[PDB]
């Protein structure tokens, strides 16, 4: 279920880059940034909730009193909603007070007219950036804590390498964003968004598709048993 | 009066049963089968 | 003083175990076997010394061939679909001593191997572990033991922990 | 349903209505024994048990004693009466070989039990040694009910047969057949001249003592599960049966046609009973709930 | 091969990091003007090291 939700949010993430191409308008400059912010926070939340469940399942060897309802199937979506609630409310408050707009800039250059979008309030954008970075940083710890889980349940190698690409790509573009202006800042934004989404999709899913469709082995339920048999040490038999 | 006292008695009984069930839920129960005259006594020691 | 269910209690590494020895009931099993629906696992004991030289108060009823029948009946009950079995094969010293004189071919019709202890024990384990048909739901843990082996409690502990872990993955839908 | 009783935590195996048609008694596969109160759902007593393998329970006609039993092969009597304010074991009756599968109070000093040893017995609670032993069954006795005059009783065992004993002479006098599998329940007609059975063949039959014959069979083509409990209502017009498929059925004794159905349990029904005045029906199931229908 | 605390894995990790850093450096260098060319060229060095 969380995989389906993550795939839907990632579909939203690629489609969110199509608002940065074409002539700016009043509503496009209002829908540019919140779309990507929410569509990426959703994926981060899905990853966090999934990892937190397997650990809680695996760290409950003693007969368990209540965590049974703590790892409920329906509460995962509630946790995801609680994680994205901050982004939702910040975007709503930002659009309420000082929404973006369209601007014809005649002061950057004498003989050229530039069409750009205003931001209304930079604080309301810094808050989104900080929240996304904080969740991405928490993903590092949640991947670190999950490194000792058995096979088919451990993904600590792929969570970190998808956040590293995101951080590197979005840090290396700071000088160009600060100094350069024109029609290429939008191209930089599109490239960064597209690269982050591609890295996430690849590093999360391309490893499994290969075992599922090709090398259809490690493919039955009579192997995943032996694989899950390592955390507690006795699964002994001859078969 | 009598209904009230029965209410507190029932509440105390329910509390005791809840605690007993909570304590008993944390134990592993094993059924020891086996063929006759085959062992099942050394395992006990 | 009591007869019928017998109970033993012990602790190991912050766990509590309860063992029921209902083998002294001496009545029809089918009328009370369903009272144990909910046990974590079933511990089964088989003596390797019966492979031959001892039948049971009868003429053509091998003790091992009756233990196999009881294992087949127990492992495939309607009430024991999800409960795993811990199988103990005891008295291996006598088996090793008697392999050199009495081969294994007197018990089962086809091969054993080298009439060597290492090869006969593996074949007996394979034959005894093939009587289950619920392979998609339950699992079997086998551990050769003797009168001197002293590591049985850690095998039981680890098997119980593994059973508990896989049971929870199933509820959550993961496995 | 009119009242629902909660508080158990495991499967429920027995139940017996009180002689005042107000209080109950229930036994679950724990060490617990709760005395209920169907008028206002407040519990009265809760008795822990040494062995958590209870199979039957009974409530004394004097309202002062109860009984238990199970795979421990022992019947125990509890002093529910004034005993300085609590309950303690009065006597443990030993001597049976197999498990104990039914027990009924005759008086405050005599109790009849049936066991899986293919043997019933009549005990003496003051001494603890059985005074009469009823033998003749070749299978495990599963049910037992007493006549209104408490001078005759019947039994059913895992061999298809029913016997009519008398508590004084200690000898069987009549044997009734007709079933083709094990028999699980039995109870007398209110007049004491007939009884009904319930087997694993999904059929219920009626027998009469004077004619030594089988009168009617109550069955259907949509039932394959066996019966676990059988009870007559007052005047004998309505026969109540509890089945494995979560359901309870109401029959017509005279014409053998279904007249109702009871469906409120999510698990197998293991016990049912009707009050002395025929005012209510109680049902127990393999979940931890009880219900009262009216 | 776990020869020395899984040494053959961290080498692969570092090489992948190096390649990612410079591949990401290409477009950022290609779209920067003025005094920030040094800014975009120092960051890659620091990250790789
Ligand atoms: C261009 C500018 C960009 C600036 C960023 C670049 C900075 C330099 C980058 C990196 C230095 C460290 C690289 C970390 C690589 C992770 C290695 C890895 O992948 O190992 C995988 C797993 C464990 O191994 P396993 O699962 O495969 O097998 C285990 C199976 N068993 C247990 C049986 C053995 O390791 C784990 O658990 C993961 C534990 C946590 C990982 C630590 C990551 C720390 C990241 C710091 C960067 C912060 C952003 C920079 C902010 C600056 C703002 C001005
Ligand atoms: C994970 C990473 C995801 C990112 C995707 C990477 C692929 C992107 C492909 C193309 C993006 C180009 C952006 C177009 C913007 C228009 C700018 C333009 O093309 O104009 C032209 C500029 O360009 C160029 O001549 C080329 C720019 C030089 C780049 C270095 C390339 C050689 C690299 C060494 C790095 C290490 C390589 C390692 C090999 C890896 C192989 C495995 C002319 O304009 P100018 O003279 O006024 O510029 C002046 C800019 N100043 C002031 C900085 C000079
Ligand atoms: C679409 C994109 N806005 C990028 C312009 C600000 C910026 C340009 C260049 C570098 C940086 C940063 F690396 F300093 F963050 C920020 C965006 C919208 C909403 C949330 C976001 C969260 C993280 C990253 C991008 C987010």
From Swiss-Prot, chain B:
Family: Belongs to the G-alpha family. G(i/o/t/z) subfamily.
Binding site for GDP: 37-42
Record's disease association: Auriculocondylar syndrome 1: An autosomal dominant form of auriculocondylar syndrome, a craniofacial malformation syndrome characterized by variable mandibular anomalies, including mild to severe micrognathia, temporomandibular joint ankylosis, cleft palate, and a characteristic ear malformation that consists of separation of the lobule from the external ear, giving the appearance of a question mark (question-mark ear). Other frequently described features include prominent cheeks, cupped and posteriorly rotated ears, preauricular tags, and microstomia.
Effect seen on changing residue 39 to S: In ARCND1; likely pathogenic
Stretches the record annotates as G1 motif: 29-42
Protein name per its UniProtKB record: Guanine nucleotide-binding protein G(i) subunit alpha-3
Binding site for GTP: 36-42
Compartments, as annotated in UniProt: Cytoplasm; Cell membrane; Cytoplasm, Cytoskeleton, Microtubule organizing center, Centrosome
Provenance organism: Homo sapiens (Human)
Binding annotation for Mg(2+): 41
Lineage: Eukaryota, Metazoa, Chordata, Craniata, Vertebrata
UniProtKB/Swiss-Prot annotation, chain C:
Documented effect of changing residue 77 to A: Decreased affinity for PLCD4
Positions bound to Mg(2+): 2
The UniProt record lists the keyword Signal: no
GO BP terms, alphabetized: adenylate cyclase-inhibiting G protein-coupled receptor signaling pathway; adenylate cyclase-modulating G protein-coupled receptor signaling pathway; cell division; GTP metabolic process; negative regulation of adenylate cyclase activity; positive regulation of macroautophagy
Residue segments, region G5 motif: 145-150
Assembly behavior: Heterotrimeric G proteins are composed of 3 units; alpha, beta and gamma. The alpha subunit contains the guanine nucleotide binding site. GTP binding causes dissociation of the heterotrimer, liberating the individual subunits so that they can interact with downstream effector proteins. Forms a complex with CCDC88A/GIV and EGFR which leads to enhanced EGFR signaling and triggering of cell migration; ligand stimulation is required for recruitment of GNAI3 to the complex. Interacts (inactive GDP-bound form) with CCDC88A/GIV (via GBA motif); the interaction leads to activation of GNAI3.
Residues holding GDP: 90-91, 93, 146-147
Shown residues in whole-protein numbering: 180 to 354 of 354
Organism: Homo sapiens (Human)
Region described as G3 motif: 17-26
Residues bearing the modification Deamidated glutamine: 25
Annotated Gene Ontology cellular component terms: centriolar satellite; centrosome; ciliary basal body; cytoplasm; cytosol; extracellular exosome; Golgi apparatus; heterotrimeric G-protein complex
Reported effect, residue 78 to A: No effect on binding to PLCD4
Impact noted for substituting residue 79 to F: Increased affinity for PLCD4. No effect on binding to CCDC88C
Residues bound to GTP: 1-2, 22, 24, 90-91, 93-94, 146-148
Region (G4 motif): 86-93
From Swiss-Prot, chain D:
Phenotype for residue 60 to T: In MRD42; decreases receptor-driven G protein activation; decreases complex formation with gamma subunit; decreases trimer formation with alpha and gamma subunit; no effect on protein abundance
Domain of life: Eukaryota
GO terms of biological process kind: adenylate cyclase-activating dopamine receptor signaling pathway; cell population proliferation; cellular response to catecholamine stimulus; cellular response to prostaglandin E stimulus; G protein-coupled acetylcholine receptor signaling pathway; G protein-coupled receptor signaling pathway; phospholipase C-activating G protein-coupled receptor signaling pathway; Ras protein signal transduction
GO MF annotations, alphabetized: GTPase activity; GTPase binding; protein-containing complex binding; signaling receptor complex adaptor activity
Pfam families, sorted: WD40_Gbeta (PF25391)
Positions bearing Phosphohistidine: 220
WD repeats: 1-48, 49-94, 95-135, 136-177, 178-221, 222-263, 264-294
Gene assigned in the entry: GNB1
Post-translational note: Phosphorylation at His-220 by NDKB contributes to G protein activation by increasing the high energetic phosphate transfer onto GDP.
Alphabetical list of InterPro entries matching this protein: G-protein_beta_WD-40_rep, Gprotein_B, Guanine_nucleotide-bd_bsu, WD40/YVTN_repeat-like_dom_sf, WD40_repeat_CS, WD40_repeat_dom_sf, WD40_rpt
Protein known as: Guanine nucleotide-binding protein G(I)/G(S)/G(T) subunit beta-1
A single cellular component GO annotation: plasma membrane
Protein family per UniProt: Belongs to the WD repeat G protein beta family.
UniProtKB/Swiss-Prot annotation, chain E:
Lineage, broadest ranks: Eukaryota, Metazoa, Chordata, Craniata, Vertebrata
UniProt tissue specificity: Expressed in the temporal lobe, frontal lobe, parietal lobe, hippocampus, and cerebellum. Also found in kidney, lung, liver, heart, skeletal muscle, placenta.
Compartments in which it is found: Cell membrane
Disorder: Hypocalciuric hypercalcemia, familial 1: A form of hypocalciuric hypercalcemia, a disorder of mineral homeostasis that is transmitted as an autosomal dominant trait with a high degree of penetrance. It is characterized biochemically by lifelong elevation of serum calcium concentrations and is associated with inappropriately low urinary calcium excretion and a normal or mildly elevated circulating parathyroid hormone level. Hypermagnesemia is typically present. Affected individuals are usually asymptomatic and the disorder is considered benign.
Phenotype upon changing residue 10 to S: In HYPOC1; does not produce a significant activating effect; decreased cell surface receptor expression
Consequence the record notes for mutating residue 13 to A: Strongly decreased G(q)- and G(i)-mediated G-protein-coupled receptor activity
Outcome when changing residue 20 to A: Abolished calcium-induced G-protein-coupled receptor activity
Phenotypic consequence of residue 47 to E: In HYPOC1; some patients have clinical features of Bartter syndrome; shifts the concentration-response curve of calcium ions to the left
Effect upon mutating residue 21 to I: In HHC1; decreased G-protein coupled receptor signaling pathway
Stretches of the chain found on the membrane's Extracellular side: 33-36
Transmembrane spans: 10-32
């Amino acid at each position: 279920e969380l995989s389906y939700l993550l795939l839907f949010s990632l579909l939203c993430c690629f489609s969110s880059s199509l608002f940065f191409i074409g002539e700016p308008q009043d509503w496009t400059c209002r829908l540019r940034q919140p779309a990507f912010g929410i569509s990426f926070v959703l994926c981060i939340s899905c990853i966090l909730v999934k990892t937190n469940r397997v650990l809680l399942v695996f760290e409950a060897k003693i007969p368990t009193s209540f965590h049974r309802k703590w790892w409920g199937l329906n509460l995962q979506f509630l946790l995801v909603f609680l994680c994205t609630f901050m982004q939702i409310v910040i975007c709503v408050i930002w659009l309420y007070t000082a929404p973006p707009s369209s601007y014809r800039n005649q002061e950057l250059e004498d003989e050229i007219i530039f069409i750009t979008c205003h931001e209304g309030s930079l604080m309301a954008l810094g808050f989104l950036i900080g929240y996304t970075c904080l969740l991405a940083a928490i993903c590092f710890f949640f991947a670190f804590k999950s490194r000792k889980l058995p096979e088919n349940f451990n993904e600590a190698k792929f969570i970190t390498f998808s956040m590293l690409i995101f951080f590197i790509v979005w840090i290396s573009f700071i000088p160009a964003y600060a100094s350069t202006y024109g029609k290429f800042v939008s191209a930089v934004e599109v490239i960064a968004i597209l690269a982050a989404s591609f890295g996430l999709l690849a590093c999360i899913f391309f490893n499994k598709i290969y075992i599922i469709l090709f090398k259809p082995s490690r493919n039955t339920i009579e192997e995943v048993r032996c694989s899950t048999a390592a955390h507690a040490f006795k699964v002994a038999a001859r078969a | 009066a009598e209904d009230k006292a029965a209410v507190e008695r029932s509440k105390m009984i329910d509390r005791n049963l809840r605690e007993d069930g909570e304590k008993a839920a944390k134990e592993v129960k094993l059924l020891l089968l086996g063929a006759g005259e085959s062992g099942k006594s050394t395992i006990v020691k | 003083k009591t007869t019928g269910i017998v109970e033993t209690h012990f602790t190991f590494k912050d766990l509590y175990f309860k063992m029921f020895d209902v083998g002294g009931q001496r009545s029809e099993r089918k009328k009370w076997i369903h009272c144990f629906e909910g046990v974590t696992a079933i511990i089964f004991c088989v003596a390797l010394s019966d492979y031959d030289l001892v039948l049971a108060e009868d003429e053509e009823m091998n003790r091992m061939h009756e233990s196999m029948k009881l294992f087949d009946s127990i492992c495939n009950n309607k009430w024991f679909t999800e409960t795993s079995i811990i199988l103990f094969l005891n008295k291996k010293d006598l088996f090793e001593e008697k392999i050199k004189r009495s081969p294994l071919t007197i018990c089962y019709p086809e091969y054993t191997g080298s009439n060597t202890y290492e090869e006969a024990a593996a074949y007996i384990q394979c034959q005894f572990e093939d009587l289950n048909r619920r392979k998609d739901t339950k699992e079997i843990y086998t551990h050769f033991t003797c009168a001197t082996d002293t590591k049985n409690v850690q095998f039981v502990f680890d098997a119980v922990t593994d059973v508990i872990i896989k049971n929870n993955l199933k509820e959550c839908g993961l496995y | 349903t009119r009242r629902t009783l909660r508080g158990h935590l495991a499967k429920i195996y027995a139940m017996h209505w009180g002689t005042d048609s107000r209080l109950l008694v229930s036994a679950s596969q724990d060490g617990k024994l709760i005395i209920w109160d169907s008028y206002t759902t407040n519990k009265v007593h809760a008795i822990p048990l040494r062995s958590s393998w209870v199979m039957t329970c009974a409530y004394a006609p004097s309202g002062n004693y109860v009984a238990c039993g199970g795979l421990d092969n022992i019947c125990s009597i509890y002093n529910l009466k004034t005993r300085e304010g609590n309950v303690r074991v009065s006597r443990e009756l030993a001597g049976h070989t197999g498990y104990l599968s039914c027990c009924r109070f005759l008086d405050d000093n005599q109790i009849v039990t049936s066991s899986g040893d293919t043997t019933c017995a009549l005990w003496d609670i003051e001494t603890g040694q059985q005074t009469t032993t009823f033998t003749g069954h070749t299978g495990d006795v599963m049910s037992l009910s007493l006549a209104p005059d408490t001078r005759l009783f019947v039994s059913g065992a895992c061999d298809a047969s029913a016997k009519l004993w008398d508590v004084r002479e200690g000898m069987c006098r009549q044997t009734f057949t007709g079933h083709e599998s094990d028999i699980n329940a039995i109870c007398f007609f209110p007049n004491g001249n007939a009884f009904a059975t319930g087997s694993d063949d999904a059929t219920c039959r009626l027998f009469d003592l004077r004619a030594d014959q089988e009168l009617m069979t109550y069955s259907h083509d949509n039932i394959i599960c066996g019966i676990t409990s059988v009870s007559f209502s007052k005047s004998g017009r309505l026969l109540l049966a509890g089945y494995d498929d979560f359901n309870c059925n109401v029959w017509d004794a005279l014409k053998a046609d279904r007249a109702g159905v009871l469906a409120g349990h999510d698990n197998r029904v293991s016990c049912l009973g009707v009050t002395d005045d025929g005012m209510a029906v109680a049902t127990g199931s393999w979940d931890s709930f009880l219900k009262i229908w009216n």
